[PDB]
Design a protein around this ligand. Structure first.
Ligand SMILES: [Cl-]
Ligand SMILES: [Cl-]
Ligand SMILES: [Cl-]
Ligand SMILES: [Cl-]
Lengths: 153, 983
């Protein structure tokens, strides 16, 4: 565990702009390094590929002993994201340590968008749609992408 | 669930007798009594003396000359109203002991009498324990007799886990990378294993741990052929153990060791302690007099002869340790609060094992010393004069440390954060130490918590008369009752230690202090105090307990790691998905039930009241709220239901039962049938996904019944149908009458088919029609059995458990899990506090050899004692200037401008500041864009902060910590300390 929380945050922010992850931006609030505004591009060859999605991220008191909090702001049709932005994410739950960092959370979310998981669902309706009616569910995800997400450059 | 009961409730068989009531005897007796037993009986006819007050906290100077056993009985009785404390009038023959189940012999009983008492107890079937303390030395001996059986060695919950694959040969592999947590030689049973039929019948299997995620069983082709699934559960099998008498053990001792680095000493002291008694025999009952070389060398000779009488104690070729035994003689008369508290907790726990049958007893001897507490003799000489008595209560501490070091203890300035269990034991140790008792010393204790009872009068400074008052105040006054020398020296505050109080606890306050001690549980307070101690370069004494486990940590400036550098990871949180739909443990159902409580009985009432009282509620909620639909649906349902009679509260609870444990489950199975296959091609309901079955309400099922009872009562509270007043021992008939006449709507799977919000708001009633209408929100009080809260959570969790075939839990176990109740027992608390007070001595001597310090860990279940050298602070180097990553920092005078700071670092240190922050606020970054950089680079730090936070400095501030990132002379990144700006 680090001796200081804001020091850790500084170290991660510098490296986020220095060595960014493609398709993802992550920038803190000047008056609160614990709140991050995030956007993720929809992965190419997926229902979401023409959209850009907004997320809030937060670091709790005991970060990095405690995983970040994440919530989608953009309305999205996904087996693992519910109406209030909450995400079931394998990295958020069981697997956390100081070794993992905001970078890894964002990579994981990006990958969840590329490869949804209705087998372990959060939005049970969308999961039913995805298992029984896959192509149609994907099409609804496309419609919602252009309907609610912002367009790419 | 509970702490320990059923077959392990033998403590209500058990009458304990304690012989000798000096400090060791009282520490033991206090711990036992607080714990709870059938009876405590004490025996010490000897008259009180001033010296006795070194560690015996229940004695005062009014008592000098009276019997110790008489003057301690009343105060020990105060501790637990459920434990009778008697005094043995006289102990004239051994058969008087037959009325007791455990007999304890402390430092006041001669070894001759210990051998006699013990032979009697062992041959009579009575458990014997003895203990002694000799300055910084100590020992204990346990003898529970011929045939003792260990039925619960560790006391911890039995490990369990889900099986993925088992072959014809053993090799049980787990599910999705999970620890079994079992050790070699453990035994396990199985359930729900498909294929291997009679492998599920309760048979045990020895476990060979071949990996952290698998283990071996053997041949299992006879039970069947594994198909899928399964759960394993550890079972602890009995272990029969034999204890040898004291006489057998004196020449053939079996040791439990107290310190890796001191293994050999145990055989030395075993002889030494014996010789001490042999010395008292020859010298008319006296011990070796202090720092006396004549008596010391007489003791060396006594031991040297005892070695030949007991060759198996040292073995072959092992020499007697003159210097060790010499120090034993020097310190024989010492009475040190830390050592006495350590052995008090340790020995009290052994007594409780002997009473209960729980845990694994000590077998059979343990020896302990803390000689590195001794100061530098150069600094503090030890001889017959410096160490001599002075007609004070501290004489038997002076006996070890000398008067000058003891005076330094008196003139120390100390800060104690927290007045809980450990805080109270700490104030007791300090009272006995006379710490902060000199004219240049003081104590500051602070705690903003109030007092409230636990179970059967726990806590030995707080009483029923004290409920509601502050912990710090009552604790300070109690220890002043124990030692008046601390009257008016305890500054008992009630402030919280954090950012919100930095003008009370400021530069001056912290810099005055000699050292800090933390007696707080939560991680936030601990990291804050730790970082203060790093900032002001103060030593910090840390401790913690978790049931029978405990630890101590020393944080030494410019020397060791801090507390935050090594703190443990917090507890796993429940994954949201498993919580919502796929529970497999009672913890999940309990957490879900708590959520439901919150929504039913607290949130809905608050929302209704806001809507009825505020005029723009609907407009505002539309403007700024993530879950608009949830809030409005809550309100509209709360107001559309409107129960007018308790009949309707019962009906509402029953309909909620149907919704949550029938319809919602049927909807879930609609989405994913029990034989539904994933896109993968495998079943959807595999692994930790247990397919539920919907419940059919049965009023004779206890959980269904109590769900209805508790929910109807709490809704009746919300809608004012019954306040805190109802004969809450209900009859099934009353509720069955209402429920059998209800029509239960059939399950409609809602696959039936801005826009929805407007319909909601159209539904809401006009508040003018609800004139004078109010909902009374519930507040979750777990420590009140009248209120139906734990009843509701238990029953709700258990019905959901019935859904997914998870085994139910009773009110007490549900209360344990739902409260996150962390155990606090008296034994471990006293012991760990004792060890902290032993490292304190090393702080007083301002020791800087890291090998002199001791971080401690204990597990009184096994029992295990272990000590370890503190970890050195990590160190680095950026431009060949090496530095201490924890403690070092940069120092800067005045409210310098940001540009001057950057330039100063380029010139003096060679650093290129890339990032700079003050607390949570980012003040400057290398990637900041031009317009941004220009407005800041020319600002003073104080104004820079005013710009970012849009709030000016409070003005009481004199110093400022700043974190930074920077590159070196090459341009590559290097690690660097923090910066202190002195205003
Ligand atoms: Cl004695
Ligand atoms: Cl076996
Ligand atoms: Cl016990
Ligand atoms: Cl003194």
């Amino acid at each position: 565990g680090m001796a200081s929380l804001p020091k850790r945050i500084i170290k991660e922010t510098e490296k986020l702009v220095s060595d960014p992850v493609p398709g993802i931006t992550a920038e803190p609030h000047d008056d609160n390094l614990r709140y991050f505004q995030v956007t993720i591009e929809g992965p190419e060859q997926s229902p979401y590929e023409d959209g850009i999605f907004e997320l809030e991220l937060y670091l709790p008191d005991d970060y990095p002993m405690e995983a970040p909090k994440v919530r989608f702001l953009t309305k999205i049709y996904h087996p693992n994201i519910d109406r209030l932005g909450r995400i079931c994410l394998d990295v958020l739950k069981t697997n956390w340590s100081p070794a993992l960092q905001i970078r890894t959370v964002l990579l994981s979310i990006q990958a969840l968008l590329a490869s949804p998981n209705p087998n372990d669902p959060l939005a049970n309706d969308v999961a039913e749609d995805w298992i029984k009616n896959e192509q149609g569910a994907k099409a609804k995800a496309r419609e919602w992408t252009k309907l609610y997400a912002k367009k790419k450059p | 669930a509970v702490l320990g009961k059923e077959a392990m409730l033998k403590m209500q068989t058990s009458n304990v007798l304690i012989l000798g009531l000096k400090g060791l005897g009282v520490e033991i007796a206090k711990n036992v009594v607080l714990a709870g037993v059938k009876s405590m009986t004490v025996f010490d006819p000897e008259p009180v003396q001033l010296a006795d007050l070194s560690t015996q906290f229940f004695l005062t100077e009014k008592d000098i000359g009276q019997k110790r056993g008489d003057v301690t009985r009343a105060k020990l009785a105060e501790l637990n109203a459920y434990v009778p404390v008697n005094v043995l009038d006289s102990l004239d023959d051994v058969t008087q002991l037959s009325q007791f189940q455990v007999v304890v012999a402390t430092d006041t009983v001669s070894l001759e009498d210990k051998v006699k008492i013990n032979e009697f107890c062992h041959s009579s079937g009575i458990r014997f324990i003895s203990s002694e303390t000799r300055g910084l030395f100590g020992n204990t001996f346990v003898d529970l007799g011929d045939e003792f059986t260990v039925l619960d060695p560790t006391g911890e919950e039995p490990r369990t886990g889900m099986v993925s694959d088992i072959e014809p040969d053993g090799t049980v592999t787990m599910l999705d990378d999970n620890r079994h947590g079992l050790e070699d030689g453990n035994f396990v049973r199985f359930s729900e294993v498909e294929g291997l039929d009679k492998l599920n019948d309760g048979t045990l299997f020895k476990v060979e741990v071949l990996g952290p995620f698998a283990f071996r069983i053997g041949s299992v082709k006879e039970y069947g052929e594994y198909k899928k699934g399964g759960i394993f559960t550890e079972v602890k099998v009995p272990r029969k153990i034999s204890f040898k008498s004291l006489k057998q053990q004196l020449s053939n001792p079996e040791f439990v060791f107290s310190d890796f680095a001191k293994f050999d000493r145990a055989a030395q002291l075993h002889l030494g302690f014996q010789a001490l008694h042999q010395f008292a025999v020859r010298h008319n009952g006296e011990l070796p007099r202090t720092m006396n070389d004549e008596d010391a060398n007489e003791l060396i000779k006594l031991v040297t002869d005892l070695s030949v009488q007991q060759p198996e104690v040292l073995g072959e070729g092992v020499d007697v340790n003159e210097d060790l035994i010499k120090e034993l003689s020097y310190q024989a008369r010492g009475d040190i609060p830390g050592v006495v508290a350590f052995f008090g907790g340790l020995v009290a726990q052994e007594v409780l094992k002997a009473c209960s049958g729980k845990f694994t007893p000590l077998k059979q001897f343990m020896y302990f010393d803390s000689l590195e507490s001794l100061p530098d003799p150069k600094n503090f000489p030890r001889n017959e004069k410096t160490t001599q008595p002075v007609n004070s209560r501290y004489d038997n501490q002076i006996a070890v440390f000398g008067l000058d070091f003891q005076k330094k203890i008196a003139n120390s300035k100390v800060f104690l954060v927290g007045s809980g269990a450990i805080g109270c034991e700490m104030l007791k140790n300090w009272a006995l130490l006379g710490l902060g008792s000199g004219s240049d010393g003081y104590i500051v204790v602070t705690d903003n918590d109030s007092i409230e009872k636990s179970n059967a009068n726990r806590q030995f400074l707080f009483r029923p008369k004290d409920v509601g008052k502050n912990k710090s105040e009552v604790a300070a006054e109690a220890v002043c009752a124990m030692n008046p020398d601390l009257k008016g020296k305890i500054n008992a505050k009630i402030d919280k230690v954090g950012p919100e109080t930095e003008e009370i606890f400021n530069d001056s306050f912290w810099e005055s202090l000699d050292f800090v001690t933390n007696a707080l549980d939560n991680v936030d307070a601990r990291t804050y105090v730790d970082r203060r101690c790093v900032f002001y370069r103060k030593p910090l004494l840390e401790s913690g307990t978790l049931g029978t486990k405990g630890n101590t940590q020393v944080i030494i400036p410019r020397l060791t790691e801090s507390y935050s550098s090594s703190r443990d990871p917090p507890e796993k949180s429940i994954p949201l998905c498993t919580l919502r739909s796929f529970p497999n443990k009672i913890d999940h159902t309990i957490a879900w039930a708590k959520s439901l409580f919150q929504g039913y009985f607290t949130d809905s009432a608050e929302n209704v009241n806001m809507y009825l009282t505020q005029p723009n509620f609907v407009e505002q909620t539309l403007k700024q709220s993530g879950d608009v639909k949830g809030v409005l649906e809550s309100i509209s349902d709360s107001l559309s239901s409107k129960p007018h009679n308790f009949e309707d509260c019962i009906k509402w609870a029953r309909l909620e039962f149907e919704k949550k444990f029938n319809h919602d489950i049927k909807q879930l199975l609609f989405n994913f049938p029990k034989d539904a296959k994933t896109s993968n091609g495998e079943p959807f309901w595999s692994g930790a996904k247990r397919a539920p079955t919907p419940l059919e309400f049965d009023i004779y099922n206890n959980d269904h019944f109590h769900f209805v009872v508790a929910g109807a009562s709490l809704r009746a509270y919300n809608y004012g149908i019954k306040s805190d007043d109802s004969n809450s021992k209900p009859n099934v008939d009353e509720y069955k009458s209402v429920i059998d006449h209800m029509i239960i709507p059939e399950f409609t799977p809602n696959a039936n088919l801005s826009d929805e919000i407007d319909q909601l708001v159209s539904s809401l009633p006009d508040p003018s029609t609800l004139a004078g209408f109010k909902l009374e929100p519930v507040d979750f009080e777990k420590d009140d059995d009248t209120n139906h809260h734990i009843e509701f959570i238990t029953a709700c969790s258990n019905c959901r458990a019935q859904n997914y075939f998870i085994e139910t839990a009773d009110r007490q176990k549900t209360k344990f899990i739902a409260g996150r109740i962390i155990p606090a027992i008296a034994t471990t608390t006293s012991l760990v506090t004792g060890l902290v007070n032993l490292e304190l001595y090393k702080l007083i001597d301002n020791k800087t050899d890291i090998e002199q310090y001791k971080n401690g860990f204990v597990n009184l279940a096994l029992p295990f004692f272990g000590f370890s050298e503190p970890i050195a602070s990590p160190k680095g180097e950026y431009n060949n200037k090496k530095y201490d990553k924890i403690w070092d920092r940069f120092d800067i005078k005045g409210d310098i401008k940001l540009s001057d700071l950057i330039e100063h670092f380029e010139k003096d240190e060679g650093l290129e500041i890339t990032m700079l922050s003050y607390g949570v606020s980012l003040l400057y970054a290398s990637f900041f864009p031009p317009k941004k950089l220009k407005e800041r680079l020319n600002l003073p730090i104080t104004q820079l902060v005013k710009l970012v936070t849009k709030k000016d400095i409070p003005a009481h501030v004199s110093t400022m910590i700043l974190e930074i990132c920077a590159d070196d002379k090459e341009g590559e990144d290097v690690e660097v300390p923090f910066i202190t700006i002195h205003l």
